[PDB]
Design a protein around this ligand. Sequence first.
Ligand SMILES: [Mg+2]
Ligand SMILES: [Mg+2]
Ligand SMILES: [Mg+2]
Ligand SMILES: [Mg+2]
Ligand SMILES: [Mg+2]
Ligand SMILES: [Mg+2]
Ligand SMILES: [Mg+2]
Ligand SMILES: [Mg+2]
Ligand SMILES: [Mg+2]
Ligand SMILES: [Mg+2]
Ligand SMILES: [Mg+2]
Ligand SMILES: [Mg+2]
Ligand SMILES: [Mg+2]
Ligand SMILES: [Mg+2]
Ligand SMILES: [Mg+2]
Ligand SMILES: [Mg+2]
Ligand SMILES: [Mg+2]
Ligand SMILES: [Mg+2]
Ligand SMILES: [Mg+2]
Lengths: 159, 175, 75, 168, 187
Amino acid sequence: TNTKGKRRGTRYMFSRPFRKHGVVPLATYMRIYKKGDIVDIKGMGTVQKGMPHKCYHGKTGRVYNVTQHAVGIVVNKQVKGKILAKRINVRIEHIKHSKSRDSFLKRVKENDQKKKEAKEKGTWVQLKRQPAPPREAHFVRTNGKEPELLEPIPYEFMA
Amino acid sequence: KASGTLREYKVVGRCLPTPKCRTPPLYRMRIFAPNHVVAKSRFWYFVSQLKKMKKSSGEIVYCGQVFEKSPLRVKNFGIWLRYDSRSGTHNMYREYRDLTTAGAVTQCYRDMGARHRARAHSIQIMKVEEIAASKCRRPAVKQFHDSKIKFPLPHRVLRRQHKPRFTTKRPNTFF
Amino acid sequence: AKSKNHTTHNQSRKWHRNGIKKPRSQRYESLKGVDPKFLRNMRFAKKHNKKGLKKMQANNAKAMAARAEAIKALV
Amino acid sequence: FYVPAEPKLAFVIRIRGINGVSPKVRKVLQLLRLRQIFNGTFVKLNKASINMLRIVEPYIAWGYPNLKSVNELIYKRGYGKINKKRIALTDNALIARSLGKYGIICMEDLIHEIYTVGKRFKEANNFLWPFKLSSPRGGMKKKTTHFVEGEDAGNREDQINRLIRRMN
Amino acid sequence: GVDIRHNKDRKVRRKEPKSQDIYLRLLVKLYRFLARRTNSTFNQVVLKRLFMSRTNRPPLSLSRMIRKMKLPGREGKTAVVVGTITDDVRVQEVPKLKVCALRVSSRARSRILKAGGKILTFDQLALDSPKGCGTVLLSGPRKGREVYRHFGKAPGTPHSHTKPYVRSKGRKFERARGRRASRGYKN
RNA sequence: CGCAAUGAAGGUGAAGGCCGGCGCGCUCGCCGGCCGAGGUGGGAUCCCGAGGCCUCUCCAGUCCGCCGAGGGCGCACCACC
RNA sequence: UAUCCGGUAAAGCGAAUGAUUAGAGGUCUUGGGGCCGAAACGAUCUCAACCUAUUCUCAAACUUUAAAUGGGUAAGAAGCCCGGCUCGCUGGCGUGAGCCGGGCGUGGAAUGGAGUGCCUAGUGGGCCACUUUUGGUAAGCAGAACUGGCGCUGCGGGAUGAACCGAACGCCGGGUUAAGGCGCCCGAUGCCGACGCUCAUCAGACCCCAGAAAAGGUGUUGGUUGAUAUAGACAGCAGGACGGUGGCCAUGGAAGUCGGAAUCCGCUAAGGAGUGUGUAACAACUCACCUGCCGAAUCAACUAGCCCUGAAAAUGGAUGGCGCU
RNA sequence: GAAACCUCCCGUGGAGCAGAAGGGCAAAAGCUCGCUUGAUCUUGAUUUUCAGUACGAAUACAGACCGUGAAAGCGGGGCCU
RNA sequence: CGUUCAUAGCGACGUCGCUUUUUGAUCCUUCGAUGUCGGCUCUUCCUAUCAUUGUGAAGCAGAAUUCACCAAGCGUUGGAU
RNA sequence: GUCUACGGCCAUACCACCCUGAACGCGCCCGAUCUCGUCUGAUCUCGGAAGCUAAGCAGGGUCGGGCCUGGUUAGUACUUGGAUGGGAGACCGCCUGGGAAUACCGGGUGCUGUAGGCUU
Ligand SMILES: [Mg+2]
Ligand SMILES: [Mg+2]
Ligand SMILES: [Mg+2]
Ligand SMILES: [Mg+2]
Ligand SMILES: [Mg+2]
Ligand SMILES: [Mg+2]
Ligand SMILES: [Mg+2]
Ligand SMILES: [Mg+2]
Ligand SMILES: [Mg+2]
Ligand SMILES: [Mg+2]
Ligand SMILES: [Mg+2]
Ligand SMILES: [Mg+2]
Ligand SMILES: [Mg+2]
Ligand SMILES: [Mg+2]
Ligand SMILES: [Mg+2]
Ligand SMILES: [Mg+2]
Ligand SMILES: [Mg+2]
Ligand SMILES: [Mg+2]
Ligand SMILES: [Mg+2]
């Protein structure tokens, strides 16, 4: 039976990468989280105040509270049969903005551009995405030179 | 791979074009298989080994059956192999005598099963080349190279053993 | 008479009989556990919204009249 | 060379039973509506769809149906989903009643929507109740192994039409 | 063999009322018919409620019926209640109402009729309005029963406010180890 | 038993708003009038309803529906303040 | 489709940590032992550790790298975009939050009716298989992971059988299948089935499975690589096998011959400073190069198929049986 | 003198940080000084074990009263487990 | 090693097996009981052959012999503790 | 072209040695009355401005080390899913999709924000 200790098994998780030890460079601290920012948690060894628990590393969630130098952040943690949305108080250093949402906002902005225009025109445009369709009919010109023959090569033992 | 009687297929394909490589080179093969479906698969297997190129990364351009151009000639075919033993992997040069390449490769696949308990999926056919009377290294072939060939069909054992299941006459096997 | 000591064998199955339901998201979640000094001040702000009502109502009527003038100019 | 278009649409037959089947497979098989053995569905192809077929490969036989296949399946075994009651398409009054809000007003329209994979495919294809086909007459080759390697499972592209005729 | 779970195939809703009383059952015969033959969903809702339990059709107090009709616009209408109409002693002035109910208590009956109110039975409502047109369909507070105060996240489970089943309240019935901080802990 | 709680106890015990005036409107204290169980989101259901849709003719034209875009009062219940 | 998380497989050790082989190079250091030195970083070796490039081989409790499978989020009306009010928070002005009031609709694929509350029994001995996996020589042993079974469950196949494969059962007719089969037992090959392989005085004969290995075999069949030979070979028989030379080390005797460093020339047609026999040691014998005869292929070394040796148990016996070439 | 003290050079930490090991740490989290008692008083929220009960341990705040620093700040015990 | 000579007989360092007449592992069966050691008595099987029949080997001259093959037909005793 | 002050990302920015630096800067530099601090005006603090780019600093250089980025290694190693595939086992081959890491060989060797100079 294994030890219940808080930091058990974070030998690798909380360990600054190769040649990225030392001073926590300052952008990290000086970037602003509001309420409802989508934020991915990633514990860090240098800063031990406000560390998240090893279960929430990797996990993404939303900011609910913002204190002086930390951010309350609702994240969903599964427990055997039940997913528990729960609220944890991570110090900034263990947290980035999750880009996952921004590619969405880019698309909605692009849609609002393509909805305003193409209204006065009349031609309705494809706003929905569509999965990669089968690759269409097309010609391939074997331009002058014929195809290159590939015989499989005879075995030989190298070692 | 399994079998039945194979057909030569021509299969040419290319790693599909990109920004960086706009008009990529075509690669052609001789892929013996029971049908185009497994032909194309077999094409991809051989190319994967040789070239950094997968079914996802490429497109088969032209798969097409290839017909023996001299069906009603009797030929001698040299065939080079690459089988897998229980032990290590090997090379051979088999020789068959047949009316077709397909027939000659089919013939090979049966022989290899017989003589080496080698199953389809172990065998790689590299080259199949029709060959003269000479340049035939195997005496099992060479004995049929002769103008006035002459042999009997000596102990001609009967079939139709159950047309008359029972009969008065003891049979005959001299003809 | 030693036992089996621990397992997780039939458990995933057991969990998924009744789903593994995601935690039921509402709009308007509580302000439980929000930095006290904030909550005081948003409470006070909420207290005095009724102060500055008469100004606000007039501003919307002026807006509504400007909308009605704009729609009349369009038509 | 003329490399023709990769196919839009494929018929997908469930070719093994409903015992001892992994949960990820099982879910996809009930996202293709392939619950019983020897049920089949049309399926429009694309990166998403094709990969879902990749996750259920040794549980299905599938490929690119003929024109005739789409007719024979629709006429001989064409059943509507009409107030959630599997009902046989005996008249166009049934098809129309349900799909007529799309311009699909008859069996023929339906066949054209399925075969060309139109705008309104999702709605015509879902309208069709999944095709309960019989066992394969003349038998199969091998249930458990892939087509390529002698068996019946997996993509057999053109050759799905032979299988269709011996089952429909 | 087919894969479906047969687990939640049978829906558990009521079909008829569980009561055997004959007057209610006549109302059911009437509202089944109307439900099916009218387009009115009022009839359907009413029909549904005739099958429900006592618990499930709670009493609607006179004051609650007042204030719900005091609301702006539903004026010159009829309030309907598949439950009973009770009095409120803590309301005085009772406007002249129109009412449907399976029951109205004798006080509540007097007060309403004294006001110039009309009381209707459900057979009478149908003839008056078979498609439920110009009705206010109310309900009593379902979660009134003291029952519900024991339901929820259990007592002694942090942030629950759930009445425990206790023999008698008082200084020394619970309120020790697990409510005081002084005694063990608290939730 | 229920219709009142809460405190170990001495005990205390579920209303608020608005308006006008008087005290310095002091987001505090006192005097007159009006409303009277707050508000947000969702809510079965009711309510209003542009507008169709025809009538054996060209228009007029009350009656009856059917649908109804749009807009409202919003039970219960839930979440939030 | 975007976007984060990861330190397992692999890989690496001319990158850290630890392990570890070899020689090059280095009075690095210095030594301990030498030999030639009185002694001398003098000359010459040496072994110690250290170092300069290289080099061999490793890691559950090492790692610069770094997969596959995998875990989060996100993919819109609870969303966007305007206008204005509230704050005892924050502040050069501004933030940030909370309020009102308008303005805008399908925002990846596939599927499916959802939500929600109360009472609640039995259970809390488990076992089995794929794959992963710890202890152990191993176990029908013990212990985890993952899915699926059996337990709760019949049915076709596997002769027999919890668990293998196929498939999951209302009561019946017709059809068709699966996995398995089709000499007879026993439904179906009573095909003019196709091509090979293999004879066993222990033949062989189908997932789980109920049985064999190293190592052998001109048994037979295929390969692979090299030869050889008309300058007529290859075997099969017949003729010589010497001298410089008791060569040198070794004496205990080795003039070819217990052993070992050597190891070339002459005559040459050609014979090794010698394969053996044997001798105290010789001798004597025996083992190339070439012919004479005969008359086309010959021969070597690997390799992998079947077969065989290897292969011993107790009541009489089991490819299921009969049998089968 | 191989080791005392002084001085110059190189030194990515190969040292040290009470203790096991792992992580973390260089104008520090090490060493040496100066001043100190935030190891003080008081509400709730949260995390970790979890049944998502307790205990312990911790995280973010908030209100007091202080410490220290030119200050920004940091500090309500021991860099983190 | 056996004067000489790897293999008549042997056989190191290594290696591959069989066996269940040793002992361990293990705990599947039996705790509403399967009588727990030895000896006597009696039958039957196995061969991994001591003798006996037929044979190959030798470092078999004879005699004595060990090594191996077919082989379990027939035997394998009397006593002291 | 380039610098100084405060920077962001933190080696394409590090290290070694070599060369070149106009003007403005930045420095070294000259002093200890006062501020401040040392065993020591070396450092620290302070008041300067005679010299000089020697050094720091910048820019460049090196078949340089290092780092960064491509190729190769290699569809190799590994691997998701499959079979009544093989094999006495150990292990291996196929199908289905995913797919690395050295050695070796190329190329690159800071970009840039705000405020202020100089080259008028
Ligand atoms: Mg247990
Ligand atoms: Mg299977
Ligand atoms: Mg059931
Ligand atoms: Mg690990
Ligand atoms: Mg490894
Ligand atoms: Mg029990
Ligand atoms: Mg056990
Ligand atoms: Mg049981
Ligand atoms: Mg199965
Ligand atoms: Mg400390
Ligand atoms: Mg404080
Ligand atoms: Mg000897
Ligand atoms: Mg035992
Ligand atoms: Mg007995
Ligand atoms: Mg014997
Ligand atoms: Mg000075
Ligand atoms: Mg300089
Ligand atoms: Mg200079
Ligand atoms: Mg370089």
